[PDB]
Symmetry: D2
């Protein structure tokens, strides 16, 4: 059996230990009931975390056999950069994009923490991810891809667990009954999950479509919708070498994690990258979220502007189509499946490899920015190529006339189709007024 | 022969008469050389045109046999609304979109003015569209689809024409030599083409990638990048009935043209919808443009937000894929070809028909706005459906466990593929650190 | 609760009564245990059924409250024709195709029999479809789409049912213990499911990949692989009007069911349309089947040959892409979902509507046939259009030279990309020998 | 200027010297008029060529400065194998496929012969490919990608050439007037172009759709449609290692050219792989051809059968979609463009790399064959996985019930859409009879 519904007494069980009430109470309870819990805390460069080292120590205090801090920043940023290179984003509204930051975080922690558990002889993961979300499924696959012998204990399937730690208040009472003066965090009107690529806000009041970003206190940027917050316009340069982001404002970095942290600071000052999406969950039901990803947004804008100046139309269209499809697979927890790897590897090799260049932007408030300059030794755009100024052209007016004439047979075929569609009722006429009129409900 | 290189003396020739120097000098010249020109001016609701009635009168004064004002506003707005319903936009940069406003305008005028010419027994169109642009090709097909017997005279293929009206100065001198005290318009640092769906700015200084929107004086909106321009935040509501935009700020309109003019006013106050694109022309070479489309942008944002709250994932993905493909066909001048009609009709019938609802936005500067509310009697998003509050769920925790178990065989297959790809060199390992590592250049 | 695990005593329960041992024993058992079963038999024009009227009478004899014969032939053939018009087939191997005949049959019976049950005040369906197949899921959705109040009783979830009717032998013993001298059918080396569109053979010895079509006794055609079976070559004509198949061998029919029965006879004489597929089930695991669909294959060949002579390339490619996607949705039981309806309606309206014409074939053995003639008043293929004979061409040699020159800028860009890819290691060189060499494992 | 319309007197000009009347007369004429022609003959393993060495000697006799035999077999077969691995075939009719053998041949010779010319200081190619075909465009790009300084002389643009060598008879008379007792080949009712991957037959009587394969004398196989030709059934095995075809009938080869020649012999004995296609040319007008490719067909069937037993559904669908798109690019002469390389490299790396296995077939006549066995150490199909025999399953009946329940919310949404579409007129009803009825012309 892969899924365990009862606490495996006397056995080693791993817990992805965040340090919050849920994992603190669960770890203490698992130790108290006879299991041997091992805690693993992922360093994800969370914007609202200032003391990762204190977390494993809290796990030991609550009963962990051993507690480790697993650094996942390097891997997280590497996958985030791959996602930018592939345009692996599928939830967009009016062009505004969610950068799939939670899905990227899960691909990294679901594999890395289970690998750390395996290394320690821990083959059971006590994962509390809930039954209505996407993470329960993402963690299930990533964990099993990493350890074929993995078993997953879902505490909420254990009646003994539910009877004692059924909610926040029960858990708080439990900690106190166990001798720990636990202090709960201040309640918010929504729930937040974050990593150094982005933050997601959902649930509670954000379940209502008449709530908006205004109820959120951003953790990676400023409240740009508040007129009293001063945000001076700022010029910023983003430079890539073979698809890899290497410099911001003319400066290079010791590693990609430092680069991403600076991208976040720059975008954050403006509130760049925030969006509000209604999305389709893996289970085919909709949820709503508010998102932040300042650095990812900054890199995305510059990367796409260079793409438009370097690649041909067929290639750009394959980037958009394959990237969206890849974004959906990423969201589904299938980032390492063959159908995703084949799209990601393709886009990195043939599209991203040629993205060498620099884009200059002026950032103002929120998503309001302007492109100021675009340069690249690989540009196929050239000011002289299609200019009507001066002269000297690769093709002549007579050449274009020949190209137009080559369209004649197909134009005749299309006209004949218009007559055919009018005869079969799909068009009112192939003309009337001149413009063909399609016969459907939207034709007023 | 379809294309004529010599002025057809003694024959009727139609001219799409804009009223500018080029069409004024060409019409006068064609009359002077023995042809019988007929002028057709399209009323396109251009933002920078205040006196359409004066244009046909100027055509008569310069030599037109007859001059007509053909109203194309109703048809233009109908096609613009269809484009919104279909998401028929393919040039996007970092999510910012060009609304294909010139391609829509050409589909309407290329067919309507040629139909008006045919009605008057005019079977030759003297069209000066240039040899390096997209319009020469769009007009060629739309014209021939409308009139199988159409011939197109390209003045720039006529050496006599070039010898006399080779440039702006030659044309100006010609008007004066012909007895007309012609007054040229003030020169700008770029060229503009517009209609009531949008304005495009290109050429001259905009050919350089280090020029930006700041050199443009917007004609449909304000200079939002200028801090001295005051733009108060504004709440706006956009309501649709079966995919059709029917109310703005709770008010309905006498017709769709009035609706679009109000959408433009609202978005215009904020500079909503402006973008800067490097695009691929039909001839496979790149050009650069600055675009305005305030009303189209406002409707697009609201339409997509409703789409995300109403349709399932497969359907939304077909809207994005088919809409982009349709946008490319529209740009190519193939809006009435079978491959475009089949996508447009499909999206209107099955996607747009269910878009009944209202979206509330707060518009600030440029593209910076926030979504404040989303309502629809057709929403499939419901706050109660996936909430962890209260209780009562359509599926249980045990149900989700079963769904996860059904993934086991495919998860095993994927793990086996990871081992297989590591063996064949595509992955460093199926793990190392835990995260599979793809073997390509972007892997640092 | 939608799914019921216990027999609903005293309530009306509908059974899709095939007349075999499984449904005979289940109906008798349900009556014996206190339920009130209503039997519904679908007339699907099964090739191996000679007495549909006897079935409802057998249901009454075994305990049915009422038993009805629901004719589904007209609807089945209508959906089969729609599938041909849309090329809604996704499981192909080396070009050989499975015509999704079981998925079409389920869409029709899942909706029609539940509608018949609802009409009779029966809101519970006792459906034995098994837990490992595709049908359990197809019937579940089609049933619930038709009756929102439907509950589905799965007998195999009832321990009392399993204890008594656990297998074929137990069921046979049960019938006898209940007073019925039941005579089981002769056992075969595989299982068969059929309707007038096609027959599927799977399970038992067909689970082994070293078994082949040779172990199957075809029920819609002859054993064409057996040299001793004589099959004279046969000329056949298939004619369509606006996408609808109307004549075979110059003869018309009283209705589409008669047409399809004749198509099956013609193809059947040759064994046309048989295939062997390894396919992916809805649950993401593979199964193997042997298939027959003589009439569907005959119509498919003629329809596609006309498509190639009538439609442009973009349109043909949309037919292939959208048709495959639609085939997958059909297989998933999503034939009536928005994402499927939008593809099916599109293809019927814009692709099928223009398919008017006739194709002549010579059928020999199995899939070996030749196309002998293709005619259509809508052909865009014309022998004179691209012939090098005589003369008179719509475009001239000079015109083609101009069209070639228009490719120059993009050719330069591609060459530059080849140099760029060689520099970044994706190509060995942009040349070596002359042919660019891609750097991957398949490059020997 | 890239294209030359006049013979470049005193300059070196390369000719792709086939040895037929056209290239013999053209080379002699070019020498006679003052140019310095260099002949290049591609060894393409043509099925109807028995003496390649005699060709360069004939070129010298007619006036070549130097004449070389360039072996292109290794490169041709490498690209043919890549095409099989990628399913790069887009012209299919009823599942029957054209294997893009001419497009593959042109990609290889267009680059290799121009590279050979460049190596010899020859920067002008006298290429007679005609103005109405696809090759003029394929050769133009492949040549210019290989040599940026290439100029192409089209003899048919030279009036002096046309005046003297306007047709077959004029050319024959020319050879004789120049002192060569030239003997023309026997005339056929169609034209043929071939290489070791396949042969194409077109033009003359094949321009008429009432002509058929029966007028063709196959050059790579037998006349399988002729009952008097005896073709015994034959068992054949095809084995792949990591996507590469390595053994036929249990035997390996010294190189891939020998392997392909044996594949051709095996398929040829049966006439496997012949098809008749109406296709869309690059210029958007249709042509008709008869095709042969026995070896390619044999490898394609085995490769796809293994694909279906090894890869998941998303991956197989990407293979079909990306492969067709790649086939169209190959046909267009864009095999080395970024948009093609990105699809080809992707499919080779992630799809083909896992195709290790062996398929056994029984070949009979033409396309009539049966699959007899399928084996692979990489199969994800397993007879035990979904069998209802014995027991022991990875998922239980209860697990499937949970998976079904997870569909409930989306099923409700779809039902609601059916009601919505009936209300807006797209469906007659969400039911009537039970089956939803789409409101379009094909609904009888």
């Amino acid at each position: 059996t892969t899924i365990l519904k009862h606490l495996p007494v006397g056995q080693r069980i791993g817990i992805a230990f965040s340090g919050g009430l849920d994992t603190s109470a669960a770890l203490l309870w698992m130790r108290q009931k006879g299991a041997v819990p091992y805690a693993y805390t992922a360093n994800l460069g969370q914007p609202d975390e200032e003391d990762y080292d204190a977390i494993p120590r809290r796990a030991m205090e609550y009963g962990a056999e051993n507690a480790r801090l697993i650094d996942c920043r390097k891997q997280l940023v590497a996958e985030g950069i791959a996602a930018i290179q592939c345009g692996a984003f599928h939830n967009t509204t009016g062009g505004l994009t969610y950068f799939n930051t939670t899905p990227l975080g899960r691909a990294v922690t679901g594999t890395m923490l289970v690998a750390a558990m395996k290394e320690d002889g821990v083959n059971i993961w006590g994962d509390g991810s809930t039954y209505k979300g996407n993470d329960i499924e993402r963690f299930y696959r990533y964990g099993l891809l990493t350890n074929a012998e993995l078993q997953i204990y879902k505490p909420w399937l254990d009646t003994d667990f539910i009877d004692e730690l059924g909610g926040r208040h029960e858990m708080s009472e439990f900690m106190i009954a166990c001798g720990f003066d636990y202090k709960m965090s201040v309640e918010k009107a929504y729930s937040t999950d974050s990593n150094m690529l982005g933050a997601t806000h959902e649930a509670k009041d954000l379940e209502y479509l008449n709530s908006s970003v205004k109820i959120v206190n951003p953790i990676m940027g400023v409240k740009f919708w508040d007129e009293s917050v001063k945000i001076p316009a700022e010029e910023v340069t983003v430079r890539f070498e073979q698809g890899h982001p290497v410099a911001l404002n003319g400066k290079t970095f010791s590693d990609d994690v430092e680069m991403m942290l600076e991208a976040n600071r720059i975008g954050g000052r403006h509130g760049l990258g925030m969006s509000d999406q209604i999305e389709n969950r893996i289970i085919e039901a909709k949820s709503r979220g508010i998102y932040e990803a300042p650095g990812m947004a900054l890199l995305h804008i510059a990367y796409e502007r260079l793409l438009t100046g370097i690649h041909n139309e067929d290639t750009i269209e394959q980037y958009h189509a394959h990237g969206r499809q890849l974004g959906r697979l990423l969201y589904q927890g299938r980032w390492f499946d063959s159908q995703a790897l084949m799209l990601r590897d393709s886009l990195q090799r043939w599209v991203a490899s040629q993205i060498t260049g620099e884009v200059t932007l002026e950032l103002r408030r929120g998503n309001d920015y302007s492109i100021l300059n675009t340069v690249s030794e690989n540009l196929t755009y050239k000011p002289e190529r299609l200019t009507m100024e001066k002269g000297d052209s690769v093709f002549s007016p007579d050449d274009r006339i020949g190209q137009l004439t080559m369209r004649n047979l197909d134009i005749t075929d299309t006209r004949e189709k218009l007559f055919g569609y009018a005869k079969t009722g799909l068009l009112s006429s192939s003309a009337a007024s001149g413009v063909p009129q399609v016969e459907n409900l939207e034709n007023k």
